[PDB]
């Protein structure tokens, strides 16, 4: 009967809460009390990247820590050389309503998508000296929010369908489909070993997925509004989330727990981005109040502010060698900090 | 200094910057619009993932987008105007239409965007009022006390019982507009009949007033 199935949910939902309080003996703040504070972090702008003519929505770093890609609402993708501020390529787009970027680990392809419900792949290293479209992936019924290359032949996407997918690029077909969210999915991040990933949706929930099997393993719920950004810890055993309720939270995989909270009494705007440092001691967040904050991940006290933009910050990222950080904004500028 | 190859890459970059400037100049003379309306409203017959449309009037280009909501509405934070279409013939769904207009008018990302409101299908409204089978007062009780104000512009060949019906519905939309707007953006109403040919001219005239307010606000006259 329908009623009997509903009752089992209450029996199994309350049993999980019991198994969470049993494992909660001490807190992260109590253990980390006898550690010296980080200090006062002072960073300064080193480069300013100009040439876009509209709002900037996404960026991603190349794996050599010198090249990066950016998307804007003028229908252009641009590839930059960070050391000299030279422009390498400028790719024109068919649809101007883009929302995401991705750069391949080898460096031969870039990807973009948006409110047209299609993920496009571009070939960068060909004869006849031109970047040209190599594949168009169709099958979603809503807009694309995120995409991250898994390999030179696999890509993972998230949509406003309440669905994620895994594609084989050569064939152009969906290999697996991930279901379970009740709201639009806004972000995904991959594990260092590239065998798991996490996602966050408008239902105030976060989920951990298995690439090979196609199932959902864990579900985390502590927020009170939409989740906009997500990122793994370098170890691969934790991740961080940022919401419209003006908070950041840290979750642990092996305990199914929320470990720490990052909030202040005079911050009332939402989060747009999160990113970790190389050792995982600083947590970087972008806000709607036009600047960014630098948190101590182990003690939850602020350490600095990056304040140089005159519109909201929309994207963020740290290099693979830990040497620099970049920001984009609705004011059509990119800045590298150090 | 700079090496020979590092000097040729710099000359390549300037040619990219040069081309990025012509496209920005062409894009500055096209006006962008967004189309909204649930259904039963005749959006697709107003001007004769995303569908697009283009038209020209007095040597000015227009570009109109319909998407077929609280998440992707941020993208349209800088359009010139929003076109909202309502069917005013069936009385069972106005309260749903009024709730929709209220959420768009009171959105955080749309606090500088004006709205051109189209009340469509006024030929069917006249038939329902004249026939007398359905009564507006059943759904909106305060219709009994309403009466036409002293500024009755109404057209030559209308029954006064049809003017009363149509001036009541328009007040229900302007009351929300003037409720809490702080004067930073306004609403323009119109009456249409799904066979009229003068709607592209009416969008052109309203967009000329919207730009005028931006002009005399940028140069501090207000």
């Amino acid at each position, epitope marked *: 009967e329908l009623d009997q199935l509903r009752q089992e949910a209450e029996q199994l939902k309350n049993q999980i809460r019991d198994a969470r309080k049993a494992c909660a003996d001490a807190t992260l703040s109590q253990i980390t009390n006898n550690i010296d504070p980080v200090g006062r972090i002072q960073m300064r702008t080193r480069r300013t990247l100009r040439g876009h003519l509209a709002k900037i929505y996404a960026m991603h770093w190349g794996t050599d820590s010198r090249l990066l890609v950016s998307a804007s609402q003028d229908g252009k993708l641009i590839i930059w050389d960070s050391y000299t501020t*030279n422009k390498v390529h400028a790719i024109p787009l068919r649809s101007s309503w883009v929302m995401t970027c991705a750069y391949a680990p080898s460096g031969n392809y870039v990807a973009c998508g948006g409110l047209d419900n299609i993920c496009s792949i571009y070939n960068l290293k060909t*004869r*006849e000296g031109n970047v040209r479209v190599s594949r168009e992936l169709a099958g979603h019924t809503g807009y694309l929010s995120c995409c991250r290359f898994l390999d030179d032949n696999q890509i993972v996407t998230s949509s406003g369908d309440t669905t994620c997918a895994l594609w084989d690029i050569e064939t152009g077909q969906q290999t697996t489909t991930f279901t379970g969210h009740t709201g639009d999915v806004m972000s995904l991040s991959l594990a260092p070993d590239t065998r798991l990933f996490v996602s966050g949706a408008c239902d105030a929930s976060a989920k951990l997925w298995d690439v090979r099997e196609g199932m959902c393993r864990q579900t985390f719920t502590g927020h009170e509004s939409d989740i906009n950004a997500i990122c793994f810890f370098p170890n691969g055993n934790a991740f961080a989330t940022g919401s419209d309720d003006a908070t950041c939270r840290l979750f642990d995989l092996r305990a199914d727990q929320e470990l720490m909270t990052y909030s202040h009494d005079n911050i009332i705007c939402g989060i747009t981005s999160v990113s970790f440092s190389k050792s995982g001691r600083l947590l970087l967040a972008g806000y709607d109040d036009f600047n960014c904050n630098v948190w101590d991940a182990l003690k939850a006290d602020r350490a600095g502010v990056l304040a140089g933009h005159d519109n909201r910050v929309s994207c963020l990222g740290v290099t693979d060698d830990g040497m620099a950080v970049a920001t984009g904004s609705w004011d059509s500028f990119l800045k590298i900090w150090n | 200094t700079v090496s*020979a*190859e*590092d000097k*040729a890459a710099a*000359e*390549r970059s300037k040619m990219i910057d040069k081309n990025l400037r012509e496209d920005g100049e062409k894009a500055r003379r096209t006006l962008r619009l967004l189309l909204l309306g649930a259904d039963n409203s005749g959006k697709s017959t107003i001007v004769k993932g995303i569908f697009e449309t283009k038209f020209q009037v007095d040597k000015v280009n227009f570009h109109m987008f319909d998407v077929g909501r609280r998440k992707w509405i941020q993208c349209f934070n800088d359009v010139t105007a929003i076109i909202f279409v309502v069917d005013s013939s069936d009385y069972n769904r106005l309260q749903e239409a009024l709730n929709d207009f209220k959420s768009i008018w009171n959105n955080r990302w749309l606090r500088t965007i004006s709205v051109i409101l189209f009340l469509n299908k006024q030929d069917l409204l006249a038939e329902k009022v004249l026939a007398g089978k359905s009564k507006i007062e059943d759904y909106f009780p305060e219709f009994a006390r309403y009466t036409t104000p002293e500024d009755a512009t109404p057209e030559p060949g209308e029954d006064p019982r049809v003017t009363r019906a149509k001036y009541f519905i328009r007040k229900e939309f302007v009351d929300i507009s003037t409720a809490s707007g702080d004067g930073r953006h306004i609403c323009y109403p119109h009456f249409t009949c799904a066979v009229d040919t003068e709607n592209a001219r009416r969008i052109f005239n309203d967009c000329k007033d919207i730009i005028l307010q931006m002009n005399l606000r940028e140069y501090n006259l207000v």
Partner: single-chain antibody, 231 residues
Framework: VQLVESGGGLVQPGGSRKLSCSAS????????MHWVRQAPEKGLEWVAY????????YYADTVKGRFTISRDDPKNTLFLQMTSLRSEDTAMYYC??????????????WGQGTTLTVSSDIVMTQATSSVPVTPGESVSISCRSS???????????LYWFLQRPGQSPQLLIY???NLASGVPDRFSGSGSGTAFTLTISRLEAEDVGVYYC?????????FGAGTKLEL
């Protein structure tokens, strides 16, 4: 990709001539172009350069004031105009493409040639001139520069070329370490400032010819003398 040269023949001393190069198969306007010539029994030599967008032109000293280089992007053609021809200008002329950005590889494609018969600088030398080799062995070639080719940005600007009998040269290595597209894995180049080497492992046939070293710090661009490999 194709490049076809026209013009060339028998000219009396003091005369004039015009050469043409027509491209097909690639985006001609995004590339730079070079002219390179080869004396009937001697080695390679650089003549002139035109830039993408036509904003930079360079000439060699032996031709400056006599030759003129021009391009016509809509018609996909390249020109070279002569004046006051002497007997030192009897050679075969090549048409070369090159593109410059981060991670690029200039001097990829060389066309065929046309024959014309008329009736301070960085010097670098390849000491050896001939080497007898047998299949299945391992060989090394050496090039030595005058001043250092290593820049303050960490780049060493040295190139390697191979010209098979009866054919036009092709690229093997760019910037002293990088292997070009289509070249087998047995080729590998190393070296330091002012000393360079190239290594061939498991030598096979169709690898016999002349090998050239070139520098790209400064203009003019200078070549070596060559190194035969015979059976």
């Amino acid at each position: 990709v194709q490049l076809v040269e026209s013009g060339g023949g028998l000219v009396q001393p003091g005369g004039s001539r015009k050469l043409s190069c027509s491209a097909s198969g690639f985006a001609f306007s995004s590339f730079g172009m070079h002219w390179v010539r080869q004396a009937p029994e001697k080695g390679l030599e650089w003549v002139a350069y035109i830039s993408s967008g036509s904003g930079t032109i360079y000439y060699a000293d032996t031709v400056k004031g006599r030759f003129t280089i021009s391009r016509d992007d809509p018609k996909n053609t390249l020109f070279l105009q002569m004046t006051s021809l002497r007997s030192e200008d009897t050679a075969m002329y090549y048409c070369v493409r090159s593109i410059y950005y981060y991670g690029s590889s200039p001097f990829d494609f060389w066309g065929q040639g046309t024959t014309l018969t008329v009736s301070s600088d960085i010097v670098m030398t390849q000491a050896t001139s001939s080497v007898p080799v047998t299949p299945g062995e391992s060989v090394s070639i050496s090039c030595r520069s005058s001043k250092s080719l290593l820049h303050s940005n960490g780049n060493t600007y040295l190139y390697w070329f191979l010209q098979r009998p009866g054919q036009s040269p092709q690229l093997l290595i760019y910037r002293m370490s990088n292997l070009a597209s289509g070249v087998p894995d047995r080729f590998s180049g190393s070296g330091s400032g002012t000393a360079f080497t190239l290594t061939i492992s498991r030598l096979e046939a169709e690898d016999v010819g002349v090998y050239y070293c070139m520098q790209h710090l400064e203009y003019p661009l200078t070549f070596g003398a060559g190194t035969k490999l015979e059976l």
